[PDB]
Design a protein around this ligand. Structure first.
Ligand code: UDH
Ligand SMILES: CC(=O)N[C@@H]1[C@@H](O)[C@H](O[C@@H]2O[C@H](CO)[C@@H](O)[C@H](O)[C@H]2NC(C)=O)[C@@H](CO)O[C@H]1O
Ligand code: MN
Length: 272
């Protein structure tokens, strides 16, 4: 087997993404036969250099996940990636912690395979063009550059939320993500500040290939805006050495393999 081409010849480009449609994972499982237990997939006709672990922070977002699985599996396969899908389900009902959930995904995914790249994706964002490759680059990669929710514009130049990707080394270089952001907002700006503090830049696909759709939804109880968020992002320099992968503590309550994804239910503590 030879290494897959730099660009995949299976790519179609712009695709039609809609969410009025109903989804059945059985059909999805059925439409995507190459996808093995736990949502793992490896190219059978070429060797791919990207061993990607796609991490999804999660809690009470099953319908969104269904659409995510429905659209992304066919896409990822076309991108000729050797990947796996990890849904990090937060147990309990205390304040949501997006970033800590992502750190957990990093540690748990490594237990399965030697992934070298990590894509962190909100459950409700779907790429509109398969040229927007879900892998890592020489620089941390911001993937959802043109979200319809923001009218295809970056809400602000340093925006690093939605979907992003960090190689195993880039992730390790910043001590992973912070564990101290409970509730909505800021965790992603902290991460962006971490990158800059370790001397890195952000790589992005152009605004046309980077178009992506966000599933319109309402607020989730227990993920209200975090008031101390402004104060935390202004002090990232002082807290990133101690808050992150090296201070990460959680408890896996269960690991369930579903055909389209591995679901890891975890107790990540409470704020204080
Ligand atoms: N205009 C309506 C504003 C809606 C306010 C809710 C905030 O919306 P967003 O900024 O998109 O974030 P989110 O989509 O709520 O949270 C980010 C992501 O974390 C995850 N997430 C967050 C909260 C929750 O209860 N469950 C969950 O699974 C999920 O992957 C989600 O995609
Ligand atoms: C009205 C306005 O422009 N508000 C800005 C905020 O939207 C913005 O908050 C950030 O918004 C992103 C888009 O949803 C979030 O991903 C991000 O977490 C959130 N950050 C914080 C700290 O709340 C901030 C950027 O710091 O600026 C406001 O002006
Ligand atoms: Mn959302």
């Amino acid at each position: 087997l030879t290494a897959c081409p730099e660009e995949s010849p299976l790519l179609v480009g712009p695709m039609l993404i809609e969410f009025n449609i109903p989804v059945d994972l059985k059909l999805v499982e059925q439409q995507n036969p190459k996808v093995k237990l736990g949502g793992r997939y490896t190219p059978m006709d070429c060797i791919s250099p990207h061993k990607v672990a796609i991490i999804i922070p999660f809690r009470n977002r099953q319908e969104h996940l269904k659409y995510w699985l429905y659209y992304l599996h066919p896409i990822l396969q076309r991108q000729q990636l050797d990947y796996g899908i990890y849904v990090i389900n937060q147990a309990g009902e205390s304040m949501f912690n997006r970033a800590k959930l992502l750190n957990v995904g990093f540690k748990e995914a490594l237990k399965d395979y030697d992934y070298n790249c990590f894509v962190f994706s909100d459950v409700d964002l779907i790429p509109m063009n398969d040229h927007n490759t879900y892998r890592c680059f020489s620089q941390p990669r911001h993937i959802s550059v043109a979200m319809d929710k923001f009218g295809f514009s970056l809400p602000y130049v340093q925006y690093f939320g939605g979907v992003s990707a960090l190689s195993k080394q880039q992730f390790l270089s910043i001590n992973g993500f912070p564990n101290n952001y409970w509730g909505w907002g800021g965790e992603d700006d902290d991460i962006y500040n971490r990158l800059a503090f370790r001397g890195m830049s952000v790589s992005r696909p152009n605004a046309v290939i980077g178009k992506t759709r966000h599933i319109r939804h309402s607020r989730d109880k227990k993920n209200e805006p975090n008031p101390q968020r402004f104060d935390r992002i202004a002090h990232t320099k002082e807290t990133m050495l101690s808050d992150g992968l090296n201070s990460l503590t959680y408890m896996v309550l269960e690991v369930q393999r579903y055909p389209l994804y591995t679901k890891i239910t975890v107790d990540i503590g409470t704020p204080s």
